[model samples]
Target chain A: RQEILEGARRCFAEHGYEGATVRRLEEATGKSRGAIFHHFGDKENLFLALAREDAARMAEVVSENGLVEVMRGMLEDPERYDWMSVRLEISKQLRTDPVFRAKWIDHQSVLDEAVRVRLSRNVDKGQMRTDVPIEVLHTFLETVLDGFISRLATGASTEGLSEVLDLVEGTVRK
Target chain B: RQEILEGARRCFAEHGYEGATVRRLEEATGKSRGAIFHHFGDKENLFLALAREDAARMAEVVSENGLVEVMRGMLEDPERYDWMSVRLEISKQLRTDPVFRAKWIDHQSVLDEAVRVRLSRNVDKGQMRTDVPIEVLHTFLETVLDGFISRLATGASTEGLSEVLDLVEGTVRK
Candidate 1:
């Protein structure tokens, strides 16, 4: 299931949720129709399942260490972990389908709690700026990550964004 | 024709390109299938047309006035320019459909060129940091906008992100 899901992200990233047909999934995963159904029941489940899984995986990097870890971790496997593109698609999914969007809202709520706990620590330790609210800080970091993903996809270099990170780190340290 | 295509965006925004059936579109637009087909030739064309139109509108906001104007002007309308949610859906379309994605990539190149025109003015004045390349700065700011769109969609506050923008402005200014 996990291996198939891994392949599915690329397939979805490449072809999109709508474009990634069942045959495409079958081809992408190297699994038959019967086997695919055995695991996920259908395509949407496959998406939702791994979306939730990866959301946690992405969130955990920050939750465990901090946003710094997320930056490094995302850069580790460029082609395999294009969380930026994957996320862009999911955000669309949340908007286009009312039911799924509502469910994703719930899923995001749980995911956000994890993010909040991790971010609040910067406040607790005076690592982040004392005056700014944590929610603001959280949005700031998330926005930078969003920016990095979109920029790199367009062939921009990493040096400038990393420098911005250096400034953010100073922000906390200051 | 214009009425149908304009209405199509709300339909696509709510139901997605793939998910929005012809019937769903008919319902959303308050027009018959004949009217839609007469205007767009098909659903795909409808999406392509509106997506391109809005993309140009958004790029114009930045290319003409820089990011600050882009931000303030964006806050002017909620339903029509719900750029955060609207772009979220379009990002998926750009990634998934090959021909469209290829076309979209070219469009982005043109748009990026426009953005560069604005940012280069600051560099020409020796306003931006020397260590950080202009390409990176452009990507950095673009990525922040990407992140901000996604973040605000999730209900986070914009104040903290806005403050960070001030910090970034100084980084470029200093």
Candidate 2:
């Protein structure tokens, strides 16, 4: 199962959601189409499984390193995370698939709650800006995070991102 | 041709790129598939044409209203812009299609140039942050712009965005 999931991720990252056909999944995983589908049901579910992996990672980052590290990690080692491809597909599905959106929103709230908790602690420590409401800071960070993800997803050059991150951090810091 | 383009946009915005099948396009545009293809060449080109429409509008917003207006307009009236749907698709193709990327990179430079010129003028007026390089500021704004687009694309709550934009503007202001 681990082999199947690992190979499937490689397949999805190299080829996108639509591009990762059954034939390519077989080639990438060294398993027959039936074996892959038996485990994951179909290409859509396979992609969904891979997305869940990122969601868990995001939660971990928020709990451990704070949310900015999530964007920092994306800029520093994009390919290693396989984030751009997976996020692009997830955003696409989030927009178009009502069923996916309904389920995913609940998953998203978990990450959002983690981010809020972290931000609250920072405020308590006087490390965060309080001129605005805490929720505003939360959404601001989230907005910038998604923007960074979208920019990375387009395969654009992230030159000077360190300076940009400094600016973003400054915006939130007291 | 205008009718086809307008209706095709409606089709794309409503149904997405792949979801807007020829049959659906015919229904949306009130034109035969042949007439539509005759005008725009094919589905990809058709989407490209719609994307070009946004590119032109973006350049106009940069030149006339300044770069921040681009993001401000996005948050204020997203549906009027039809931006999220188109941007999500452009980002998808950008990652997967090298040929489209080569051509789009040139088009993107034009917009970037407009942004740079605006920032340069702002610097001359002593209205922008001088601590960091101007290019860094330019990239930061663009990154935030894309982030805003991605946030709206996911149909996330943009509550407190006015405050968020205030924070972003505060970052770059002198």
Candidate 3:
């Protein structure tokens, strides 16, 4: 299952979601057409499983570190580029199907909690303002990050965004 | 032709790109199935055309104004929702199709230029700081704004985000 999942990720990243035909998957993973169907049901389910798994892994990292580390991984880590493409593909599925969308959001709960903890600490440490709810600050930061990712895909560099982070942190920071 | 596009926009917003089947679109637009296929070749093409239209419209706005105003319209204006929904749909296509993704990036150049102009004016008028290059700041802020919009879809409020925006501007502004 892991072999097939990894192969699908590579294929999906290389050829995209639509262009990955069933035959292509069979060739990529060395799985029979029937085996693929029996295991995953369909392409969408296959994609969802892979996407969910990837998000879970990333959430684990965020759960341990924080959202800033996740952003750093996205911006500077060459290793992340490969898997991140797969995650971006999942972003499409998030909006197209309600089930997958819900699952995607659910997988990120860990990251959200981690970020919340980071914010609570910031408040205590005088790194952020206590007047604002941690929830509100975290949610808004998520929005700006999403905006940044979308622009990055369009070849926009992260040059000026550091100040953005400063300013957003300042909202709660002393 | 125009009628189909308008109807599809509404349907896409309501049911999303996947759920807005050809039948649903036909019912919404009062166009025959044959006519729909004839005009767009397929569902993908129809969506591609509509998404391009929506992006182009926003580009026009950006060219005339700047990034701040474009965002203001996105966040505060009700009419912008429909178009943004389409833009979200196009976001899916961006990862899937290289041709479409390139064009999508090309379209954003107009807005990037507009943002540069806006930042330049802020510096000239002493409305912003001058140490950071306008280009870098613009890229970073796009990341933040993208982050904010994704949050908005999940029922997140924009109150705290307003200050985040100011912080980003503050990087350049006095």
Highest lDDT against the true fold, candidate: 2
Most accurate candidate by DockQ: 2
Per-candidate iRMS values, in order, are: 3.8, 2.3, 4.5
Give the TM-scores of the predictions, in the order they appear. 0.71, 0.89, 0.71
Model 2: residues >4 Å from true position, as ranges? A32-42, A80-83, A90-92, B80-83, B90-92
For every model shown, the clashing-pair count is 2, 1, 25
TM-score of B chain for each model? 0.78, 0.89, 0.74
The sequence of per-residue lDDT tens digits that candidate 1 reaches over residues B102-156 is 7666645656666888788777877777776677566566766766666555444
- Model 1 ranges off by over 4 Å: A1-15, A18-46, A81-87, A92-114, A149-164, A167-173, B1-11, B19-52, B81-86, B90-102, B108-110, B125-131, B152-171
Q: Mind giving the per-residue lDDT tens digits that candidate 3 earns over B20-55?
A: 898899888999889999988877778767766755
Q: What share of the true interface contacts does candidate 1 keep?
A: 0.47
* Stronger candidate by DockQ (1 vs 2): 2
Candidate 2 on B32-120: residue-level lDDT in tens? Answer: 98998997788877777766677778888898867678877877686743436555755656865799887667656667777877888
* Tens-digit lDDT track of model 2 for A1-174: 778878988877777677788898888889998888898787767766766677778888988867788888887786753446455655656865799887677556667778878887898889987788988888888888877877777877779887888888888889
Model 3 misplaced regions, further than 4 Å: A33-48, A63-65, A78-98, A157-172, B1-66, B77-85, B89-110, B152-172
Per-residue error (Å), model 2, residue A113:
3.0
Fnat, 2 decimals, each candidate:
0.47, 0.73, 0.39
Among incorrect, acceptable, medium and high, the docking class of model 1 is acceptable
Q: Quantify all predictions' global Cα lDDT against the true fold.
A: 0.65, 0.77, 0.63
